[PDB]
Amino acid sequence: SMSITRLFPALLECFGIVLCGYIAGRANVITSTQAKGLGNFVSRFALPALLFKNMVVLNFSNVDWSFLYSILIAKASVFFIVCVLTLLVASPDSRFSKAGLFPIFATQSNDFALGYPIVEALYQTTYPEYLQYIYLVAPISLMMLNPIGFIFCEIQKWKDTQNASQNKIKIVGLGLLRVLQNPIVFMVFIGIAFNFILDRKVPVYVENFLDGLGNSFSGSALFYLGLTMVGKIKRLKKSAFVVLILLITAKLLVLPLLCREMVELLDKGDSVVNHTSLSNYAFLYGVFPVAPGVAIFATQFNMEVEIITSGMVISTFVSAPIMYVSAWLLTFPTMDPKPLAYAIQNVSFDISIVSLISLIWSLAILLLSKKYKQLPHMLTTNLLIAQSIVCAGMMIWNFVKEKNFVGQILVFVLLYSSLYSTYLWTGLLAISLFLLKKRERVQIPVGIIIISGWGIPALLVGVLLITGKHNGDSIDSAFFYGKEQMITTAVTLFCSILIAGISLMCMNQTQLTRHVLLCLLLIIGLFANLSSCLWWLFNQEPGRLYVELQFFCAVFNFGQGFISFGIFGLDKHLI
Amino acid sequence: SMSITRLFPALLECFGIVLCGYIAGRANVITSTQAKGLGNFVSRFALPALLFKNMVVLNFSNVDWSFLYSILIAKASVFFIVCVLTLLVASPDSRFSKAGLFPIFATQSNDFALGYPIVEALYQTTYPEYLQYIYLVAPISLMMLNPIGFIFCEIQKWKDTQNASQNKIKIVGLGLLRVLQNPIVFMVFIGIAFNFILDRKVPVYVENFLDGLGNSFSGSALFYLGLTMVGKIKRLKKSAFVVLILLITAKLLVLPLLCREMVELLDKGDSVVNHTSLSNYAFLYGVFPVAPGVAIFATQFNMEVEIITSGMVISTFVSAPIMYVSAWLLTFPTMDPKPLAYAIQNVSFDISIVSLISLIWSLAILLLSKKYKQLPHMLTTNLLIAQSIVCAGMMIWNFVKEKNFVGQILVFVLLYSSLYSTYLWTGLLAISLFLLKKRERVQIPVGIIIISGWGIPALLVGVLLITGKHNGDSIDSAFFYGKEQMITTAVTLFCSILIAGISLMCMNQTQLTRHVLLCLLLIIGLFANLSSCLWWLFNQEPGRLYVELQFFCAVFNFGQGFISFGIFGLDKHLI
Ligand SMILES: CCCCCCCC/C=C/CCCCCCCC(=O)O[C@@H](COC(=O)CCCCCCCCCCCCCCC)COP(=O)([O-])OCC[N+](C)(C)C
Ligand SMILES: CCCCCCCC/C=C/CCCCCCCC(=O)O[C@@H](COC(=O)CCCCCCCCCCCCCCC)COP(=O)([O-])OCC[N+](C)(C)C
Ligand SMILES: CCCCCCCC/C=C\CCCCCCCC(=O)O[C@@H](COC(=O)CCCCCCCCCCCCCCC)COP(=O)([O-])OCC[N+](C)(C)C
Ligand SMILES: CCCCCCCC/C=C\CCCCCCCC(=O)O[C@@H](COC(=O)CCCCCCCCCCCCCCC)COP(=O)([O-])OCC[N+](C)(C)C
Ligand SMILES: CC(C)CCC[C@@H](C)[C@H]1CC[C@H]2[C@@H]3CC=C4C[C@@H](O)CC[C@]4(C)[C@H]3CC[C@]12C
Ligand SMILES: CC(C)CCC[C@@H](C)[C@H]1CC[C@H]2[C@@H]3CC=C4C[C@@H](O)CC[C@]4(C)[C@H]3CC[C@]12C
Ligand SMILES: N[C@@H](Cc1c[nH]c2ccccc12)C(=O)O
Ligand SMILES: N[C@@H](Cc1c[nH]c2ccccc12)C(=O)O
Ligand SMILES: *[C@@H]1O[C@H](CO)[C@@H](O)[C@H](O)[C@H]1NC(C)=O
Ligand SMILES: *[C@@H]1O[C@H](CO)[C@@H](O)[C@H](O)[C@H]1NC(C)=O
Ligand SMILES: O=S(=O)(O)Oc1c[nH]c2ccccc12
Ligand SMILES: O=S(=O)(O)Oc1c[nH]c2ccccc12
């Protein structure tokens, strides 16, 4: 099935080059004007030769059409609901532009650039026929859905132009002509025509010419994608943001669920293994981020560049953890016990590397800027240090099972002392934000907060250390002392959530602009972890999904540094 | 040995993409400012990743050091002769700048962009160890010769600054520091260092990241090469051009001869087949055009941009026919009788394809511009149609020998009637140029020239048709009637050369600026062809190299259209 062992390097390449593009772009080496030439080259030269070649070589006989109808119907439904509510809710002066552009935003995946390398890694040696579906699903959806949006936007231009229903032919013709002149449709039509005309075989003189342009697309397209995100997120407003929240939730969440349910509803085959693999591939297909061409369309039309560009950037970022978590969630139910144990260990190992590097970057920038010296930033720096110790502890922990038994205990104490400190530090940060905006005079005794933040977890760790019999055969940090450590974590989370929650609601009734959000996102995370803790303790021994629960704790425990890094580290601060 | 059957497709890709870069640039799609961004990506990101990966995997045990030592000594000698004469002849105010850049121009081949794809096509399945030699010879030559040139140019900056031999350390240090900070030297040193440390194996997480950036270099470097040549050739002056003539002959001609002779002198091996292949591979390596990075160095220093940019552009075009002709001449001596026959037929077939398409473009622009209507331009248009028929005739000829015998004769008459006309049209062009610049009154009776240009070859063709017995088993146009056709060609060439030659020398003693040159290059061609004709007729039956002689006629007969297209076709003319 899924060769998920070789999925992480494919996610380290796709976003490693995007990181290189970002670093190069902000380092000011290749400015925006120079970047336009690399965009024109990639978008007008590399992509048409790749599509033309692949369309020439497709063999129209082994394609399972049920998958094709399920995805096209799902995309149509997603387009329909977004357009309907956009027409129903948007303001009268600006309604047709939104109804014409939002449904394209919520349905146009980034399939070639990111989709092809990941599908190839998982599926090249297992079930070779799945790779070819990428070049079939994308063009038909583009052909059938983009012209409608351009029709609506042209209708908006006509309405603002002080007109009527006159020349109903011409709005349709301009939309069709604008769709046809894009360097994608013409070369897809030519490739399909030459597939039948030339009888499925590329001429010898032109194969290498097509391959030279075709192979240069992936790296340069990723690099220009990274270079195009520099500084585009900008400031915002309430209503905009709430729209963005819904649009990204609609795409990433509701598209894959419809795709899987329909695939499960229409395919009727006698092969259970093929049924399972096709359903999983159908789910994984929809998670792909929004295609960068939508922002190009917005720039050319000049009417929603800020919203669409912010949407594409955030959509790209949120998609990275989702593919990993979903992939390992679908491959969990049907395997052995101990290979599952290795699965949880491997996932925790992989996540700790990225969290540690992001934390190191964010902490170094915080330290160098000398901004660590004031009132609120000091507590955040303390929080990040604790998260760093948690990640380092996990890295030291994984290589330990076959080594000195004495080393087990010190690392256990270190891990849960720092994890508890991270929990309490979130509440202390919230309380300090409560105090900072109000409360004149009576400055915060920071020494007291530091003493409480470190002494309390150590005492709790020592209490857990004394009570409990060590289980030497349990290859997991969660069951060294069994029930007693696990019960303590639930109590610790509840105290932190109440302390952090009470202060935050008081602020609303009574740099801030960002700080508050880091508290808000963390509080959402702690609630999810707490429910996982509650389910296991109350329903006997081992719940219906113990592996799923443990995987959730591992993700929310070792990935917090990435969330912190995203807000704080990638900020401009003069050295 | 050399798989030359698959060398033409490799030359249709390398220069096919370069054509796309040229067309796009003049079409104004990607202007000069935008083009700088595509250079920064290729020169600083894709290229450093390609060298670093390959240097890690090299196995320093199977490398034939005799081949390695021969090229480095050969490159040094070419560098030595150019610098010595530059100091002796250059003007005193500008002498140090030229000596620091000219030897670099004549020794820095385009090995990565153009050399590697061609060597792979010929040598991937035959002798796999030849591919690895590209990555050894290129970095060492760059490291040992370029630092010397930057030393000399810096001395000129010091000299013009009114100084002395003071701070001799800093002049040496300035040259060394500038070479090291270039994104080429630093990544070669790191790759060699990590080869021994990590024991020749790339880490799994980083292999795919390097491959994504590495494979994007080949397609994008060629495309950017075409876009940088747009409009750079410029106008010129006398003393400039004569320098350019010598510099290009030094790189392309005298460098490969030294490389082959030394390889024959130092390699002492018992394998004749390996000895033959190694000697042939050494020749083809030096024919590569001047690397585009030299013009980058000229632009940064701002001192010889006009000469060096013109040199690199002209060097690329001349290299294309040279690689093709040289490759098939080394593989001619050692084969069968009848398999050689296909070689002459195949080469003539391949050259006709490129000449026919180029002629169509050049002729079409002339007709549309309505410039065909005046006195001198009219005769050139007559000349180009005649060259077109010769190329058109060869394609019908190759396919017909196994078909209707009657079709043999009509095509035979057609080919030599037009071929003879092409010879005479060259002389008529020269005489008209003689008359145009002088001779007022008494305008040219163009009707007489049109009658003379076509009626005379037809009468000569008819005489050859009657006299001679057809040889049905001779698969070649040159021996249908044996001796009588061959004798006539020599006489026809002599009359044309004398008529064209006499007028041209009269012009010197007594648009022009370009026209004259097309006559001059053609006259050089007819002399070379005539000597080939003379050798065969006077030294019995079949010379020491009959295949070589016949091959020369085929190149100069069907490739004449290519020479004409370069001057006339690639010209700006308002439609
Ligand atoms: C995870 C381990 C496995 C995968 C590893 C694979 C590799 C992973 C590696 C990935 C790194 C990829 C690097 C690409 C380029 C980065 C730089 C960049 O463009 O910065 C942008 C920053 O943009 C933001 O600020 C976005 C913030 C989004 C946070 C979302 C958190 C939700 C996570 C939970 C999701 C659900 C959890 C799952 C639920 C099931 C643009 O910068 P700018 O425009 O200048 O604006 C910033 C500056 N300003 C803020 C001051 C204005
Ligand atoms: C041959 C068949 C097999 C191989 C096939 C492989 C593929 C073959 C395909 C090749 C096509 C390659 C396309 C690259 C881009 C072309 C466009 C371009 O850059 O134009 C440049 C033009 O440059 C010149 O004008 C140079 C003229 C050189 C002529 C040399 C003739 C010698 C040939 C004999 C050699 C020895 C013979 C052999 C002896 C043994 C730049 O243009 P510009 O800067 O605007 O300047 C022009 C305008 N202006 C003039 C008005 C100012
Ligand atoms: C294998 C694991 C991979 C994990 C990947 C995903 C996790 C990593 C993700 C994120 C962590 C890193 C984020 C950096 C992006 C921000 C850049 C930035 O702000 O620009 C700065 C400049 O730019 C520099 O100074 C460039 C620094 C390059 C070093 C990067 C090291 C980390 C790269 C990864 C290697 C890891 C090790 C891999 C091998 C062991 C600041 O710019 P400014 O203040 O706007 O002004 C510019 C100053 N100037 C104009 C004077 C020039
Ligand atoms: C397989 C054999 C391959 C052989 C390859 C090597 C031999 C062929 C080599 C050379 C022959 C062709 C040389 C053309 C280069 C000059 C272009 C030029 O000057 O630009 C012109 C514009 O540009 C155009 O209008 C673009 C025309 C594109 C069509 C090209 C067809 C030939 C390509 C090959 C396909 C062959 C068929 C292959 C398949 C059977 C003029 O520009 P301007 O006057 O400066 O102003 C611009 C006008 N504007 C600003 C209003 C826009
Ligand atoms: C869970 C799966 C199915 C869907 C993903 C939905 C959630 C996790 C996504 C959708 C919209 C996202 C938000 C969109 C916009 C921003 C603003 C940015 O400056 C910080 C991140 C933040 C606040 C994102 C956090 C994560 C987010 C809430
Ligand atoms: C014969 C092999 C080994 C070496 C190649 C040397 C000859 C063929 C080369 C070297 C220098 C070349 C010339 C250099 C510059 C120009 C100016 C350009 O506007 C037209 C072509 C023209 C006039 C070239 C014609 C071909 C040329 C004479
Ligand atoms: N414009 C702010 C909105 C915001 C930040 N923090 C908040 C807390 C509550 C409500 C809104 C916000 C943003 O996108 O970051
Ligand atoms: N500058 C001219 C020189 C030139 C053209 N034709 C000539 C004939 C003879 C002597 C010099 C020339 C050129 O490069 O094209
Ligand atoms: C999928 O195809 C068939 C069932 O349709 C069956 O051979 C098996 O389940 C799978 N085979 C391959 C080769 O994937
Ligand atoms: C070249 O290598 C040796 C001679 O050095 C001999 O086996 C033969 O000539 C060639 N072999 C191969 C494998 O190329
Ligand atoms: O089908 S698309 O995903 O839109 O392909 C693309 C079109 N334009 C692009 C620019 C950067 C990366 C990918 C691009
Ligand atoms: O080693 S080089 O040949 O100089 O590689 C290169 C460096 N810079 C380049 C720009 C275009 C094409 C090739 C290039």
User: Which residues have a Cβ under 8 Å from the Cβ of B475 and sit 6 or more positions away?
Assistant: B341, B345, B401
> Angle at CA B22, nearest 5°, toward B21 and B23?
95
Which residue in B13, B17, B213 is closest to A17 by CB distance? B213
Answer yes or no: are the C-beta atoms of B6 and A204 closer than 8 Å. no
User: What are the two backbone dihedrals, phi and then psi, of residue A7, each rounded to the nearest 5 degrees?
Assistant: -100, -35
The whole-angstrom separation of Cα B575 and Cα A400 is 79
Chosen for mutation from A14, A45, A52 (greatest number of chain B CBs closer than 10 Å) is A45
- Counting Cα atoms < 13 Å in the Cβ hemisphere of B464 gives 26
The whole-angstrom separation of Cα B364 and Cα B362 is 6
Contact across the interface for B208 and A17, Cβ inside 8 Å: no
Chain-centre distance for alpha carbon B156: 34
Q: Assign A400 to helix, strand or coil.
A: coil
Ligand 2 pocket test target in B570, B571, B572 with most atoms within 8 Å of CB = B570
- Counting Cα atoms < 13 Å in the Cβ hemisphere of B536 gives 21
Interface A-B, measured as beta-carbon pairs within 8 A, has a size of 111
Decide: residue A542, CB within 10 A, 0-12 exposed, 13-18 middle, 19+ buried: exposed
CATH topology of domain A338-568: Rhopdopsin 7-helix transmembrane proteins (1.20.1070)
The residue to which tokens 């996540």 are assigned: A351
Query: The tokens of B81 are what?
Result: 């002769």
Answer yes or no: are the C-beta atoms of B39 and B224 closer than 8 Å. yes
Which residue in B13, B38, B205 is closest to A208 by CB distance? B13
> What would the DSSP string read from start to end of A185-221?
HHHHHHHHHHHHHTTS---HHHHHHHHHHHHTHHHHH
> Angle at CA B486, nearest 5°, toward B481 and B491?
135
> What would the DSSP string read from start to end of B223-246?
HHHHHHTTT-S----HHHHHHHHH
Q: Is the CB of B358 under 6 A from ligand 4?
A: yes
Query: The tokens of A15 are what?
Result: 């976003």
User: Which residues have a Cβ under 8 Å from the Cβ of B460 and sit 6 or more positions away?
Assistant: B417, B420, B488, B492
Does the fold of domain A338-568 match that of domain A4-327?
A: no
SS3 string, A495-562, reads HHHHHHHHHHHHHHHCCHHHHHHHHHHHHHHHHHHHHHHHHHHHCCCCCCCHHHHHHHHHHHHHCHHH
Breaks (C-N over 2.5 A) in chain B follow: 510
Nearest to A292 by CA among A312, A272, A275, A276: A312
Nearest to A427 by CA among A332, A487, A356, A493: A493
Contact across the interface for A29 and B40, Cβ inside 8 Å: yes
Contact across the interface for B36 and A36, Cβ inside 8 Å: no
Whole-Å CA distances, B279 to A329, B123, B124, B139, B319 = 60, 14, 18, 22, 20
Decide: residue B31, CB within 10 A, 0-12 exposed, 13-18 middle, 19+ buried: middle
Answer yes or no: are the C-beta atoms of A218 and A69 closer than 8 Å. no
Decide: residue B355, CB within 10 A, 0-12 exposed, 13-18 middle, 19+ buried: buried
The whole-angstrom separation of Cα B419 and Cα B358 is 18
The whole-angstrom separation of Cα A182 and Cα A293 is 11
- Count of beta carbons in the 10 Å neighbourhood of residue B59: 9
Answer yes or no: are the C-beta atoms of B12 and B342 closer than 8 Å. no
Q: What is the dihedral of CA A34, A37, A39, A43, to 10 degrees?
A: 180
| B204: closest chain A residue by CA | A9
DSSP A291: P
DSSP A109: B
Q: What is the dihedral of CA A34, A39, A45, A51, to 10 degrees?
A: 160
Helices (H), A161-304: 168-180, 185-197, 204-215, 217-228, 238-249, 255-266, 272-286, 293-301
Query: The tokens of B532 are what?
Result: 């080939």
Ligand 4 centroid from CA B153, angstroms: 40
Chain-centre distance for alpha carbon A251: 12
Query: The tokens of B11 are what?
Result: 């030359």
The residue to which tokens 């090995």 are assigned: B111
Ligand 5 pocket test target in A239, A248, A323 with most atoms within 8 Å of CB = A248
Task: Write out the CATH class of domain B4-328.
Answer: mainly alpha
Decide: residue B507, CB within 10 A, 0-12 exposed, 13-18 middle, 19+ buried: middle
> Angle at CA B406, nearest 5°, toward B402 and B412?
85
Query: The tokens of B355 are what?
Result: 């000449």
The whole-angstrom separation of Cα B151 and Cα A219 is 37
Query: The tokens of A506 are what?
Result: 């008081």
Nearest to A121 by CA among A256, A12, A194: A12
Domain boundaries in chain A? 4-327, 338-568
User: Which residues have a Cβ under 8 Å from the Cβ of A314 and sit 6 or more positions away?
Assistant: A233, A244, A248
Chain-centre distance for alpha carbon B122: 19
Nearest to A121 by CA among B208, B213, B215, B201: B208
DSSP A288: P
Q: What is the dihedral of CA A30, A34, A38, A43, to 10 degrees?
A: 130
Roughly what angle, to the nearest 10 degrees, separates helices B168-180 and B185-197? Answer: 70
Chain-centre distance for alpha carbon B342: 24
Query: The tokens of B102 are what?
Result: 């000219």
User: Which residues have a Cβ under 8 Å from the Cβ of A11 and sit 6 or more positions away?
Assistant: A118, A320, A323, A324
The whole-angstrom separation of Cα B476 and Cα B480 is 7
The residue to which tokens 């004007």 are assigned: A33
Q: Assign B472 to helix, strand or coil.
A: coil
Q: Give the largest Cα separation in chain A, rounded.
A: 85
Chain-centre distance for alpha carbon B27: 25
> Angle at CA B136, nearest 5°, toward B135 and B139?
80
Helices (H), A372-511: 375-398, 405-437, 446-466, 483-509
Residues 205-264 of B with CB under 8 A from A: 205, 207-209, 211-213, 215-216, 218-220, 222-223
Query: The tokens of B200 are what?
Result: 């020749």
Roughly what angle, to the nearest 10 degrees, separates helices B305-330 and B272-286? Answer: 150
Roughly what angle, to the nearest 10 degrees, separates helices A338-368 and A560-568? Answer: 30
DSSP B289: P
Answer yes or no: are the C-beta atoms of A425 and A453 closer than 8 Å. yes
The whole-angstrom separation of Cα A478 and Cα B572 is 77
- The percent of chain B in helix, strand and coil, each rounded to the nearest 5, is 80, 0, 20
Chosen for mutation from B17, B18, B53, B213 (greatest number of chain A CBs closer than 10 Å) is B213
Q: Which amino acid is at A114?
A: L
- The percent of chain A in helix, strand and coil, each rounded to the nearest 5, is 80, 0, 20
Whole-Å CA distances, A445 to A432, A437, A448, A449, B49 = 11, 16, 5, 7, 53
Task: Write out the CATH class of domain A4-327.
Answer: mainly alpha
Answer yes or no: are the C-beta atoms of B425 and B457 closer than 8 Å. no
The whole-angstrom separation of Cα B521 and Cα A361 is 65
> Angle at CA B474, nearest 5°, toward B468 and B478?
65
Whole-Å CA distances, A504 to A374, A442, A496 = 21, 20, 12
Residue with the nearest Cα to atom 12 of ligand 7? A517
Q: Assign B137 to helix, strand or coil.
A: helix
DSSP B195: H
- Counting Cα atoms < 13 Å in the Cβ hemisphere of B435 gives 15
Q: Assign A59 to helix, strand or coil.
A: coil
Whole-Å CA distances, A206 to A64, A425, B9, B226 = 30, 64, 8, 19
> What would the DSSP string read from start to end of B498-550?
HHHHHHHHHHHH--HHHHHHHHHHHHHHHHHHHHHHHHHHHSSSS-TTHHHHH
Breaks (C-N over 2.5 A) in chain A follow: 510
The residue to which tokens 């080394």 are assigned: B330
User: Which residues have a Cβ under 8 Å from the Cβ of B557 and sit 6 or more positions away?
Assistant: B390, B419, B529
Point out which residues pair with A290 in neighbouring strands: A109
Q: Where are the beta strands (DSSP E) in B76-131?
A: none
The whole-angstrom separation of Cα A120 and Cα A7 is 10
The whole-angstrom separation of Cα A446 and Cα A374 is 11
Point out which residues pair with B109 in neighbouring strands: B290
Of all helices (H) and strands (E), which one includes residue A6?
none
Q: Which amino acid is at A431?
A: I
The whole-angstrom separation of Cα A323 and Cα A19 is 18
Residue with the nearest Cα to atom 41 of ligand 3? A27
CB burial readout B141-162, b (16+ within 10 A) else e: bbeebbbebbbbbbbbebeeee
Q: Assign A14 to helix, strand or coil.
A: helix
CATH classification number, B339-569, choose in 2.60.40.180, 1.10.1060.10, 1.20.1070.10, 1.10.10.10:
1.20.1070.10
**Resolution (in Å) of the shown entry?**
3.4
